[PDB]
Structure 1
């Protein structure tokens, strides 16, 4: 019942102009300050005036730097499946018409209608946000899915299948799935410039490319909580959830160093790290769902705290929505189909028995590699080639009908299979 009815002082110290601007007579500890210049840094201290006019001391200045100017929208998701679009304060709430499932994760957007998200039980769901009667190629939800990502350039949806320990690449327009040889991965991000798939296990974080020379391991350990990929600045952040210490790192895509270790019993949601683009900031949602933590890359020691709105009171996902639209599917990375008339089995002298075809090209001139299948009756021979050339070693000599299947591929996707049947030439010497 002791009374401390005080009026507080909040100063604004701009570092760009060296100007001290101070207001008076605020009654509560909460204050909503308005009318700041964007893309600017400020220093803030607080003291408190009593009834008699004697103020308290200054505090330490906090490095407070503004969000840049723009319609900068945050997409909140509940644990009950409601989607609320706020701006960067947690104000300006718009309740979206879509209804997600229980405990949804980060929604990965394919075009402006169709998105893919992974719930808390491991199921992967598709939702058409605009017209829900059509747009999803997979009819039922798919179990044991770790995360999901999308390549805009290849036009392929990538998810980690936790049951198979594989990464499944899917066409969003047809639902055709491909097993990729990426093992024990939990989270995915693909670089669209070069086609490299970056993946993080529970133990390690590494890279998968179109050749085995392009596999670079960046980290080896607690466990990796999430990771994001910075395509523009050529760098790579991840969250390691250890023994009571949430620690974030940075490595280039080609110095591995520690940015901030957050100590406490509270930790982050797996797949909740996000790169905020206009600050160069890193966000993660907390496990209790009532708090989103933000660190700036310029100032590592300042860890900002974003409270969650009351309408979505436990949160399970938060994205900064990109203000540009997503770019469409590139037809410059699609490999052209190998012509079936150009697949010859023109042989040389001695033991040079080989199959040549016209080389498949793409629109933008990318490296087209080939996978070839042979059928000598029951005999099978599979070759992974980088040239339009395949030497036949085990030729059975007895004038067979050979079935040849050329599949062109790039680093982003694969072309259509060309299936031909060719009569083998007569082989007189056998030595």
Structure 2
């Protein structure tokens, strides 16, 4: 439209011709999109198989005038542009792109309409087509969890990768060397017989029918070796519970083989406590005797404790089993109906009883609880099961005929189980899919004990101390057990049998949001492994340090009971290093985190203006607190508010409408009555005192006096965002493709950038630099250029991106802000440290945010009378002609207040003849002088770089021209 509306009178840009041409073209493409929108959005493209999409459409009539249509592809398990395709006029498209094999795909069409980026149509998606499988896998299998169970074993859980490139066959594990193939259904492996106290390296690879994929790398320590107590220095104590005689025994060489409790009734099950030292005794009839002891002897007798049945318990239920939670201080019971086994948890008083699970006919031989790892295990004669403490998730571990007495180690995460019918060692993990043998010395024991690497096997007269490889006929030490008929329960009385310590912790993902004198910090908790439950407890206290780099001083604050912490009393404009650790109940803390360079805001009342998607506006500080809900009510989806003076502001909404608002008194102040459609952005020049906006329908820039509403079209084309430098009058504009400069003269026009698309920019007038955001294909790339070295400051990858016109320059901090497209987060990048991207969360009263501005502490300066051109004196416009062909017009030169460059624009009227001139002197030569004494009309418009003066219109008589040569 610049080349169609080219006139020799108004040069170089006939502005209303160009504006009418551009608005008619956008009206044409809007009416074409509204015509063909239903036929696009009903018709589904079909796939057939080179791969061919048939769409039941046709190319438009002005087909080369529009933008390219894009086939877009989507993984079934955002839309990216397909690069290689071949379409004819009936949309019978052939994909020449090398697709990823064995990946399902969906395809759609994008039809743009003209050069306007708003007018696109999207077709519906195709039915899902999977690529046929070929070749090696290209995605490494990402490990979920990888840890050492104990000093000899190592556990890994993983998931398959994204592009398997074939049907899945097997995963290959290499441990450095130990190699093992596992099939496709299993994603968890546990190694064995490792060295203690060295780290191993695990290399995991994916294998399909065609080949082997890439290799995933892992560094993982085993547990250190436990201290081996000999027979001469064995200081442990055991409590062996038989059915009719219970005896406590010392594992010293001089040990006391001493009576604690004899019961003539047969006891069905026991429950053992560590801090209380209480052995609850449940007999064969179902009544419960709570029996407190102390260090192997009586301090209190047995008390009959009655369990509440309640409205859960409809029928008769006779209890048989016992287990005591050492975190929750709660018991768990298995009960017998006289017709099924149902397990009901209860309190120590016995009143708060609630069932878990469902009833089953199998008899539970032993009930044991891992209170640290959050599990209750029931073992019956058919299977061993695993339940969480709230009864939410149910799992069965192993099916076997008649298992014997199992022992759960919480920090080893290995159930050691001993069938007396087999007579061989069995290790089950907590998921139950790992079953392992070990050597056992031959005798059949009903129960056992594990003490480090040592194994205690109770004989009918003695006790056998082995190390699972030496023989049971020659123990290292023996203790007499002659008064016991048989040994159904052996309890090892160590503090490691019931620990409160999870023995693993390292915090991560530490985030610090800083203010002038305070900081809010949040860190992620260390995640749970699959071996413990959601009912497992890791209740900790976190210790945080601030390391001042100015004084090099480390201050540590401890006992923080949550992951969020509001730290106060920081000196402003100072940088620190902030590091967190997690301390357990036992006082063993975690390791250090990596420190982040945390610089505070400088001192001052730094208020941020948030605007919602519903038009509510609030003022916070830079931490997001201290909120004042403002009195005014904006329209729906507003952009950043541009202030002219302290009462009148201008903003753009999400549909392109431009609105004026008077904050103080709403009855007067806005010079334009109606909102104006198709506006990209808005800005204001305080020195000229002019409001500049991009009219997107006219691809022009409109300059408006805010005191009168007089609008001037200004020759800047296809612009979206504006910022004007008030020192020199240069306008800076950003298109969708390029970012450049427009001055008063054509010599000052310089192009800074050409490309995704430019999302926002901001002008730094003081330091003479410029920043802009390029919103590419899933990567926000931020840049910097001087106003006279182009570098990329920071590239942020992800599906989340910025709102267009949302990059502001935080002057006091020296940072850049952009609101995210979800409206619940803002991102801040400092200039001195480019790599750290702090996030500011959004206050919940304005929950989807559409605008965020930094309010300046000084007020806005008033308009300058030093840039206003004075009016040209109409008496001084003389038509003085010289000799020969010099027929010219002169006037007294218009100045400004401050001495600025005043150019002129001039119009001649010889009746119907017209002539326009652009001048830089008070002088114009008239060429095509008609010689027959007409009344010339002269109009002068003086201007500066910032604004324009008034028009001087005179009418002058021509001097007589006798020669015509």
Q: TM-score range by the shorter chain?
A: over 0.9
- CA deviation after TM superposition for structure 1 residue 355, in Å: 0.2
Q: Secondary structure at the match of 1:97?
A: coil
Q: Distance in 2 between matches of 1:18 and 1:380?
A: 77
Give me the whole-angstrom Cα distance separating, in 1, the residues matched to 2:804 and 2:889: 49
Report Cα offsets for 1:153-199 as digits up to 9, x if no partner. 00100000000000000000000000000000000000000000000
Q: CA deviation at 1:429?
A: 0.2
Aligned with residue 549 of structure 2, among 7, 15, 19: 15
Q: CA deviation at 1:325?
A: 0.4
CA deviation digits over 1:86-130, x for unaligned, max 9? 000000000000000000000000000000000000000000000
- The question of 1:86 aligning with 2:620 is answered yes
The alpha carbon displacement at 1:232 in A equals: 0.0
The Cα shift of 1:279 comes to 1.5
| Residue of structure 2 equivalent to 1:47 | 581
Residue equivalent to 1:418: 952
Q: In the TM superposition, what is the alpha-carbon distance from 1:280 to its structure 2 partner?
A: 1.0
SS at match of 2:659: strand
Q: Which residue of 2 aligns with 1:96?
A: 630
Rounded to whole Å, the distance in 2 between the matches of 1:349 and 1:391 is 13
Equivalent position to 2:783, from 249, 261, 265: 249
* 1:314 matches 2:833: no
User: Residues of 1 paired with 2:554 and 2:959: CA distance?
Assistant: 91
> Relative contact order: is structure 1 or structure 2 higher (C-alpha 8 Å, sep ≥ 6)?
1
Match of 1:364 in 2: 898
Kindly state the Cα deviation for residue 60 of structure 1 after the two structures are TM-superposed: 0.2
Q: Deviations over 1:51-103 (max 9, x none)?
A: 00000000000110000000000000000000100000000000000000000
Where 2:564 maps in the other structure, the secondary structure is: coil
Aligned-partner Cα distance in 2 for 1:320–1:119: 19
Distance 1:18 1:178 in 2: 59
How far apart are the structure 2 equivalents of 1:15 and 1:106?
37
SS of the equivalent of 2:747 reads helix
CA deviations 1:324-363 (Å, max 9, x no partner) are 0000000000000000000000000000000000000000
Distance (Å, rounded) in 2 between the aligned partners of 1:118 and 1:156: 16
1: CA distance, partners of 2:916 / 2:716 = 20
Aligned-partner Cα distance in 2 for 1:304–1:296: 9
* Offset of residue 37 of structure 1: 0.3
Question: Which residue, out of 649, 652, 662, partners 1:115?
Answer: 649
Q: After TM superposition, which residue ranges in structure 1, 4 or more long, deviate above 4 angstroms?
A: none
Q: CA deviation at 1:14?
A: 0.2
| Aligned-residue offset at 1:22 | 0.4
Q: Residues 196-254 of structure 1, C-alpha deviation per residue, up to 9 Å, x if partnerless?
A: 00000000000000000000000000000000000000000000000000010000000
Query: Aligned partners of 1:287, 1:271: CA distance in 2, in Å?
Result: 11
* Alpha-carbon shift at residue 34 of structure 1 (Å): 0.2
Distance 1:247 1:24 in 2: 39
Secondary structure (helix, strand or coil) at the match of 2:956 reads strand
The unaligned stretches of length 5 or more in structure 2 are 1-534
Secondary structure of 1:99's aligned partner: coil
* Residue 379 in structure 1 maps to residue 913 in structure 2: yes
Q: Alpha carbon RMSD of aligned pairs, Å?
A: 0.3
Q: Secondary structure at the match of 2:751?
A: coil
Aligned to 2:880: 346
C-alpha deviation, 1:43, in angstroms? 0.1
In the TM superposition, residue 21 of structure 1 has moved relative to its aligned partner by 0.3
Q: Distance in 1 between matches of 2:879 and 2:750?
A: 39
1:294-314 superposed Cα distances (whole Å, 9 cap, x missing partner): 000000001010000000000
CA distance in 1, matches of 2:801, 2:597: 24
| Structure 1 residue 275: Cα displacement | 0.1
Deviation at 1:293, TM superposition (A): 0.2
Give distance in 2, aligned partners of 1:325 and 1:381.
45
Which SS does the other structure have where 2:566 is aligned?
coil
CA distance in 1, matches of 2:814, 2:553: 26
**How far is the alpha carbon of 1:139 from its aligned partner?**
0.1
Higher-Rg member (1/2): 2
Deviation at 1:267, TM superposition (A): 0.1
SS of equivalent residue, structure 1 residue 283: strand
Query: 1:25 & 1:304 partners in 2: Cα distance?
Result: 26
SS at match of 1:365: coil
3-state secondary structure, aligned to 1:213:
helix
Give the SS at the match of 2:630: strand
Deviation, 1:46, is: 0.7
Instruction: Give SS of 2:780's match.
Output: strand
In the alignment, the residues of structure 1 paired with residue 826 and residue 893 of structure 2 have an alpha-carbon distance, to the nearest angstrom, of: 52
Partner in structure 2 of residue 72 of structure 1: 606
Alpha-carbon distance in structure 2 between the residues aligned to 1:271 and 1:121: 14
Task: Using structure 2 for the length normalisation, give the TM-score.
Answer: 0.45
Secondary structure of the 1:295 match is strand
Secondary structure, counterpart of 2:766 in structure 1: coil
- Residues 385-424 of structure 1, C-alpha deviations (whole Å, 9 max, x = no match): 0000000000000001000000000000000000000000
Aligned partner of 1:25 in structure 2 is 559
- SS, match of residue 63 in structure 1: strand
**Partner Cα distance (2:921, 2:889) in 1:** 11
Distance 1:253 1:246 in 2: 22
Deviation at 1:24, TM superposition (A): 1.1
Q: How many residues align?
A: 431
Q: Spell out the pairing of 1:269-284 with structure 2 (5 A cutoff).
A: 269-284=803-818
Q: Which of 858, 861, 870 is the aligned partner of 1:336?
A: 870
**TM-score, length of structure 1 as denominator length:** 1.00
Pick aligned residue for 2:661 from 127, 132, 150? 127
Give me the whole-angstrom Cα distance separating, in 1, the residues matched to 2:838 and 2:538.
29
